[model samples]
Target: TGTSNLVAVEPGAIREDTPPGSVIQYSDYELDHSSPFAGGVAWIEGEFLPAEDAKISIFDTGFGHSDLTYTVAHVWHGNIFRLGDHLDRLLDGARKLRLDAGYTKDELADITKQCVSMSQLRESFVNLTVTRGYGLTHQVYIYAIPYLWAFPPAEQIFGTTAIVPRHVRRAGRNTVDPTIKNYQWGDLTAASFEAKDRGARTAILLDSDNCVAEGPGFNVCIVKDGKLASPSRNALPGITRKTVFEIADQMGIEATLRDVTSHELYDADELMAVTTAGGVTPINSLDGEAIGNGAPGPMTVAIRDRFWALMDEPGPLIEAIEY
Candidate 1:
């Protein structure tokens, strides 16, 4: 009830051959992951094996390399928020790194549709990962596995704390950019480990010179002077960041990029906030200091409150069973 059972931690392998039609069965969590694609039959890609039963070798590149690009989505209230954005980001990352994701935009969309239709994820987290297969250090184990997962939503919307990690990001003035969610898992893992070590929910990344980069997975937005200021997610540019601009326009709020210290974030009358999952999330505080007045800002609730108000029918992707 109060935990983050996120995928990718014990991810055994990253397969691309496995089409969007492929799904992973999650267990030990009492969740029904039965796939009903094309008539509710369990997908058998040559073996009656569940994903849990499939083991990877020490030779598995996921466990061995940093050139692995991946993405995670938080399913909410029965919808995989911004599923298109998630896959689009994945597509961009793969193309940026030159990995053949095996499908074009239309083809990828259709397959993802099949995966979702057959899935039982009403509301939870789902992850899609891409690896460069295994060379002398990796191979062509390209496949896609979609499954369910969860993280404790910030409590009481009272806010959450962010810690500056001791580690520097994999970014450099000359290397690949940080904005693209590349196959650089080690970079994120180190930041996360440091954040956990500091007893914080998420870690704020730092560039080589200690300038604040974005968080491991979310853009950093700080509220100041009646405006929302954020470091550009342009280190790779994020979809959620784009959505926030829509929200800012809708709410008549000012948002821009400006340098704000952790102290400034903590002391602001309102947090700058983080964005993902269809809306902006309020950053409660830094360390132990409450962000601004400490509770989720009115703006946060305003934005948070506006996601997923659908018409009478299910989504176009969700067709009802006609018996």
Candidate 2:
């Protein structure tokens, strides 16, 4: 009886009494019967369904052609961090791709909050995807589940190792806009395998011009001469990277965004990977060689600690979830 934009009928099949903006119930489809959320929930096709029940057509270009853009925001200690910035990036990508999300920024924000509230997870990984549906149509999907970590708490504190694969390089900027959070991970996935073969935890890919680009899910940065520097191009404009800059500024440490070469990575006093999934993680080794003292550097540890602390601190960057 509440004002729900969800219903148990197919799209365009609303009854005379059904309210406008109502979404078809996911269970009404011919797919497997509705299942429990199993600790996650998704909003798809105007329907709020258990994560397991959310499905997309195989023919959608987002699936077949990798024609989609998405953004991920993390919730920690009941607060969704940097959600507005994440939404801005998502909306910007949607506009660049010429896909209509069918919902305003505020509407999408509300839906995202509802997804997290419905899941009832204090620490969650929320994903908002805008896909190019069949033909010229577009679709939006939002989901929230448990938080994902590149390195678990124990391991992250000590830092992790990475490698620069010899053959794989990030896709050129002219080929695909790296700024857009798209799924063109051919080079990244291949580099991952190479890293695994080399007994490394992750891969740091170079750009076509042999400049540092980024890793699979994180942005790469190196600390040199008591300063921080990450690539200015051919890498995602990471929100965590921005946060690190802000934190560095507050701590009176100099941080710069400019062209970084692979050689600089090897000679750096310290290295780190910044991302939404992992926050600030120090890179202990690069390509089997020890970075600095081969452990988390002081600057990285300081920033990482402050990064988590700020999430819990009363601030505009963190939005508290009602649940």
Candidate 3:
């Protein structure tokens, strides 16, 4: 070594100019296994385990093929909304697919509660899944986990933009039952690309008749002539949409579920998108055309505020989570 100040450098680089003990190596790294919750719970093949360590077989049909149906319910202040209604919808889809959930309805409800309890998250998104098992032996898999909301918190306040694409259209009933909630997202995903490239939050696909269908994970409702008009065909009977109808009833607002054309949507006085995560969100614009005065309308804001209040209320719609 030349001197104590001499430090190892790249060949022919620093030479004797660098200082000793100042040498550096590549930084250390490690996998992140830590999560917000101490340890969440999961159910697999009738066995309960820590949520983080939960795994399903790679050879499973639910994994290999898209043969599965799932439901999501949100927790507000430690209360789950519309648990029974969501379970009913999930079970109905399972029946259509002839996929047994491997657990009774009540049992599944209990397991979902256990999942939230273990997660210890007051505000969380809960997912319940049922899969068609590994082989032709009619195996089954089920699990529930605390999931995060799809949209960020800011979107809930200002709402989001939606574009109608020229290429993609929703699959008709004869093609695939849109009412049955599943993972069928071919057209929806394609239209979403159109929205992404055009600087929109999401896309609203039209049906063959050029009538408004719905967005990716939400239902579209137009407030025209002081009535709530939403697409009846080729759209899921969203649980949140049902809740919005009930809210309108209590508020003495006219709510109708039927087909709405693009002309009506573009010309409507106000627009709103209903979903489980964001509840009733205002749609201020569509396809670069301003809805109303290009802001959340009075009725849309009223319904959204009422919906959140209902979420916090203790009632049959909300089930308490024992944290």
Candidate 4:
């Protein structure tokens, strides 16, 4: 037999909680409230359902193989920030995984808007996750709900501590490519526990070559001699990190991407980590040693203030969805 013969499996059906009359057929796409919950809404597998009611199959390859990519865009002041860029990145990841996304960027935007409309939280986190399904199919899930700050940003206004655990190291390029927004958290989570055991709030992992990579769910940057530098490899290439560069350009700060090491990281005048979850934060200490007067650096504060300020002003990056 030639190589072209292969069986195609059907996509999974909606959850059992779906109303009796509304049978979930793969051919039809519609918004459904499988079960009501006031918390939020989710668009999953061609149907919109209450966030808590949305379900994925236990046997789904995406879940079993960790074959998926995702992106998150948050709403600040009733408008979503950088939504288009986040969706573009999502599609790019789908392409890289050869996923049949089953919807265009416009369709994604519409469904996301619908979700946002359903949940009228002024401050929210909108998440879009796309997974490679059975064979070449793709499963796209979107949720827009209230934003929850994992690290109470208000409390850490000054700065926090990070650990570079000697036992665990970041996954190298050969092991798992960090470019795509995927669910590979072994290295990050392992190091996180080690950091926590040492009374550190987070961890800044190093690559096999002993160069600074990134912290869990964020990108790390160091400020030295009025210049900014982050690792060029073994990092997530964070969207906020890109925003930081843009803000840096506006402020005429010299920002460069390259390999960074512990020597420079510990001795730097300032250290900061950027993420959508925590906008911009300073790392005033590493491995119990104080960083730069034991507080957030002046430059870090300048960039962070500008980052939040930019969110307030109406701009092309923000897409306002009416509730």
Candidate 5:
């Protein structure tokens, strides 16, 4: 080896050290054996293994892009959280792209199950990455897709902090559609990195009209006067959003899904972030200001405690979040 100045860190999925009951993070290698996904598994197609394991030619159409669509909802404790809602969002995206998902709802469920069983991914987020298979050419290619990557170590949800990015959101009906969770996430990812760089966890996304949309990977929720508030327009409707709504209603908290601005977000009485996996993480700060006295508020604490307690009991994953 030349110059011995660089110490190489062994690469693998991130696990164990993550926060209590945190989600599992995977690299290409973790696609093999790793942690338990609550008796589920990291089920993936064999062809999409490592580059060494793959046999497709470089000329394969997966590398050459045309129009491809995909969806990735969070999974926890071997269960798909609000999976149906996520599927609906996926279908909507596919509809926009004029693509048949190549699988029915039941078929998709079965396929996800099979992949999980094969990989045995427990306690990790499951990533369902679908690609339009290799065709003759980019534009005139055949429908030869390769479904792959059911990573190991069930996913975990860490705390997230938000930033008021200067980059504006896309205008609905004319800008890049925010209704779909497509493959292109560069802009969102960039914002997320910026948040992390500033010592925060996630980036809060807004609509083209500067309304709070959602998080980089989940929906946004806040509590004020014991009322739940989220963006009303120009955003993807999230399954977690629905679940949280049900919770707020049942708990006698007035949950309202209306358009909110940055000022309103800061002025909220209580704050939390949500997703199928992220659940209700207490928000201590926003852009450097302490929310609810710079800690998870009393109201937020009660609901979050109640939410987790409900999970400690039992229900289907979908129903779990619903509680």
Candidate 6:
């Protein structure tokens, strides 16, 4: 219908004689031809590309219906923290979802490292995603970008606030298995909006039964009477949360995994959100109420300090990225 003419080529046609820069343009729109890799780097389908150029089909179920599983492991000072644990969780979730990216754990680990190497970021956030593509096929995407923090260093070190939206609740295990680490953030996103309206930094969700589940992209922990506890159900098994438990044990503080009620969250002496993005962050208040005099508690500070220290310690948990 327009002035542009159309040319049809035979199926499976090859034009080897065409030059590398040849173009058959039908429109006059200018295209971006720059080769800048400063933003980040990505590996998709066996090819590494600039993060800005990495693309997935619109029809992919991962984007269309959120049929995917992913994991994030942070790199600090050229070392990837708990990368094996992140890889294990990603592979386990992929297996549970019946999505195979056609790579072994070692192969995927190498690819993830390659992404970090290409990005050359001393501190980076590396993510590995396995998507259920069109049909029975599966696709993998690995990318490395600058490190991210759930809260700024000041807020994390000082303290932050959160709210539990009464109208929003975490998806139950019966509907969506939270342990699989899928992109099921409908409830978390709603709670975040409610938190914004309530003047809080983030949202910690409760399960349908009114038990504390977790916060967006992190795990919620409460210290009460010198003991630590976090939800054992309706939450992703957070690696940072595990690190907190380990640190607590080493420091002789009891840490347990059990159902935590909202009332207990309000009554706790301290509250913290543990995650890979920000390590251990203290939440001094919830729903406009102060927790333990409203400052970062001593236990929270100790745990947060240890969390960062562990990243630099020589150990199997931290893998030095051969950049």
Report the C-alpha lDDT of model 4 over 180-288, residue by residue, as the tens digit: 8878888887887787778888889999888999887788989999999999999887889999999998899999999998788878999888888648888888889
Q: What's the lDDT for residue 236 in model 1?
A: 45
- Better candidate by TM-score, 1 or 2: 2
User: By the lDDT metric, which is better: model 2 or model 3?
Assistant: 2
lDDT of 3 by residue, 1-323 (tens): 22211111111111112122322111122212364333355667767666656788888787777678878787776778999998899999889889888777898788888776766655556667777777564344333343343343345456667788888998887886688776677787777777877877778889999999988777888998888888999899899999989999899999999989989978888888788865776787888878888788888878877887876688889988886
Which segments of candidate 6 are over 4 A away from where they belong?
A: 1-39
Tens digit per residue, CA lDDT, model 2, 69-182: 999898776789999999999999999989899999999999999887777666677899999988567989898876666554544677888888888899978898798998
Q: List TM-scores for all candidates, in order.
A: 0.69, 0.88, 0.84, 0.86, 0.71, 0.88
Which portions of model 1 miss their true places by more than 4 Å?
Answer: 1-49, 54-63, 74-78, 135-151, 154-156, 166-170, 173-176, 183-187, 233-236, 257-267, 272-280, 308-323
Tell me the lDDT of model 5 at 120: 44
Q: Model 5: residues >4 Å from true position, as ranges?
A: 1-14, 18-66, 130-160, 168-173, 306-323
lDDT of 2 at 127: 90
- In model 4, where do residues sit more than 4 Å from their true spots? 1-38
Over 4 Å off, model 3: 1-40, 137-147
Better of 4 and 6 by lDDT: 6
lDDT of 1 by residue, 1-323 (tens): 22321224332221112112212211222234343222121222222224344444565555566565666554443444566777788878778777765556665545444443444333333445555656443222222233321122333144556666655464653575676665554565676676667777666665665445676556766666767766653344666565666667778888776555545544566653344432355666666567667677776666544432321126642233211
Query: Rank by lDDT, descending?
Result: 2, 6, 4, 3, 5, 1
Number of backbone collisions per candidate, in order?
A: 23, 0, 0, 0, 27, 0
lDDT of 6 by residue, 201-289 (tens): 88989898889998878899999999999999999999999999999999999999999997898789999999887688889998888
Residues 1-323, model 5: lDDT tens digits:
22111112112232434344432232222434343332233333332232122243455434455245555554444444555666666666667766665666766665555544444443334444444455422111111112211111112232334565566353353555566654455566666656656666556766666677766555678777767888767556766667777777888888888988877877877667665444566667788877777766776556555554444445654422210
Instruction: For each candidate in the order shown, give its overall lDDT on alpha carbons.
Output: 0.50, 0.80, 0.72, 0.75, 0.52, 0.80
